[PDB]
Amino acid sequence: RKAAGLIQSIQRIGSNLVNRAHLITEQLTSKTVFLNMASFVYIVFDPDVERNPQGEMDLLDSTRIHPEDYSLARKMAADALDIEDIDDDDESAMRNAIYEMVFPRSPPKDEDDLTFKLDELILDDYATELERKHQLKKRSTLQIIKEELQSRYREIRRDFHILNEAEIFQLLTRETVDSFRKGMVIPVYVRKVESSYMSVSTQSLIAGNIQRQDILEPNDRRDPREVYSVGQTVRACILDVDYYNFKCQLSLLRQFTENQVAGLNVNRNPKFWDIESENRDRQEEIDKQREESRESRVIKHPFFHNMKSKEAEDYLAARPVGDVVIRPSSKGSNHITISWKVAPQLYQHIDVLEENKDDANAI
């Protein structure tokens, strides 16, 4: 909100800010806000436009030096030029000295400006005398003033970042080099099938390759063309990645595609991991994967009755000797038990094995 108000105020006054002090003299900003923002906003200074050192514009308004240190910077510049008629209270001579130091009228051989004379100054004694007289800690401020005077508003940022192989791969594929590396298993779309090599394309268009020793199982002897076809998609395990050429090698062998399940380096330290609870939970999960579905069997036959063994015996009790009843067997849907009355309160159960069954309920 303050920025928009400042922009509107500048556009009211004339869309041009001559000097840093005009943020206070024109009532544009308050004291503390200006004190914060003075050295972080700058006004570009063109020496060809301002021929007057005593002019309204200021050299140091194009630097990072705060306005409270302008007289400090001008005293540094005046003392560096070996001037001796200078007095601290004479601001005009200070401005002339700094103007002739930063924009000399007759620069020496192969020197743009007299800023190189600043390196002869002993800033430590100046900071010591400042601390003694005025109780100001300004040792780093003298260095900042020196660096800004030698080159007004340098580029302090790091150099432009240039992408490496991993960054280029991540940029072009959106797969990091962590989620696409050796040992991982991915589905690949087969594109070419040959006698000795196979060419596939992954989901992110990275061209894969599989060799004869990695297509077929060791016990297999059939030709690769008979085993796979173009357009089919299969699972494969990564054996090498070329992050520069966007090419990878894969293997379709069972030893690589299926066994490698624990792809994460989970710290299974016994003191730091509950091994026994994990084993019990995994065993219970296998014991739940063993669950199966089952149902009764229905058979259409005049002497067939859906009864148990004891039920069949009781049913045959009311019937004379020689009558026959048929009941399902406990050994499975492929077996049938036939019970016939041998004698009063004596029955024989005979198991019959069925072969070439058309259906579980069929005969």
């Binding site: 503390t32 004190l35 914060n36 050295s39 972080f40 990072r64 705060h66 240190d69 800690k137 300004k138 040792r139 780093s140 401020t141 900042i144």
Partner: protein
């Protein structure tokens, strides 16, 4: 940005004693958070005595700048860097500069400055409640664990202690 941070603060201008307590609290909090850095400073700069005192003075000066002078972190980092570092000359006359604080530590000091005012409000409310209790003789346990209290959890514990042991006075003022 300071107005946005301090918009939720009911009253920001602390008294002198409360301000000194705030400075001490921020120094203690930074000492707790920066324990490894202080250990590295003590071990690797053993030849210099009382560097932690210089660290305390620097943290207090940064808190002084932020609270009284209302300087934001970039201004302090750029134009007040001499208060955030210590220099000395070794036996071989070697000029050595030690960087006590960084920009992230200045932001953390801003965060602790913002955080302490909730503690101050809670402590003021607890002291006011104790005043309305109006004990004939000051409770040694209350003052003992109220002087050393530095987190709102301990203030909540003291509040629970007071509302339990002096429940009759609370009922009279008013389960």
């Amino acid at each position: 940005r300071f107005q946005a941070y301090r918009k939720s603060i009911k009253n920001y201008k602390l008294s002198d004693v409360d301000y000194s307590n705030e400075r001490d609290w921020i120094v203690e909090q930074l000492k707790l958070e920066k324990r490894d850095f202080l250990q590295h400073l003590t071990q690797a700069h053993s030849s210099v005595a009382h560097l932690e005192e210089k660290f305390e003075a620097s943290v207090k000066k940064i808190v002084d700048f932020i609270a009284i002078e209302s300087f934001e972190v970039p201004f302090i980092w750029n134009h007040r860097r001499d208060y955030a570092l210590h220099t000395y000359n070794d036996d071989s006359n070697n000029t050595i500069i030690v960087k006590l604080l960084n920009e992230d530590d200045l932001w953390r000091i801003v965060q602790l400055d913002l955080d302490y005012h909730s503690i101050h409000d809670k402590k003021a409310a607890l002291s006011s409640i104790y005043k309305q209790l109006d004990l004939d003789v000051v409770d040694p346990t209350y003052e003992e664990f109220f002087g050393s209290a530095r987190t709102l959890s301990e203030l909540q514990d003291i509040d629970d202690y007071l509302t339990f042991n002096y429940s009759s006075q609370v009922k009279n003022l008013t389960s």
